Amino acid sequence: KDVPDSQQHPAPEKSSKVSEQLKCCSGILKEMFAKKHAAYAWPFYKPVDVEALGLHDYCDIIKHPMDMSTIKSKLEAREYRDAQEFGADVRLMFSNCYKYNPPDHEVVAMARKLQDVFEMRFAKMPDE
């Protein structure tokens, strides 16, 4: 088995599954990007503002800060093979977030909201 319904066929040409994942992946990011999640995903559309946030230690913490806009841009670039390229970077921005931030933080506050929506969204992602 090796994970239930994890894989079954390599993609023909490019997708049938994969770039289909990205149409989803995107609507997903674009959803965290939604005015709905723009209450808290907005600091994720764009990069951790090391100035605005008064970080300084940022570049010590952060090795790969992801931003909903690149990951999206890469969607919009089809640079992402699939939604797991996609969420790899969602997990990246989420990661670098709690990486830097304690869970009593605002960024994490925001982070975990996206964590909820993105992961829920991502649960609706294929793999076939």
Binding site: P43, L55, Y58, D60, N101, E106, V107
Partner: peptide, 12 residues
């Protein structure tokens, strides 16, 4: 001191 804990963002 693992991370500064941003002190970033206030949603607004």
């Amino acid at each position: 001191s693992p991370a500064q804990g941003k002190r970033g963002k206030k949603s607004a």
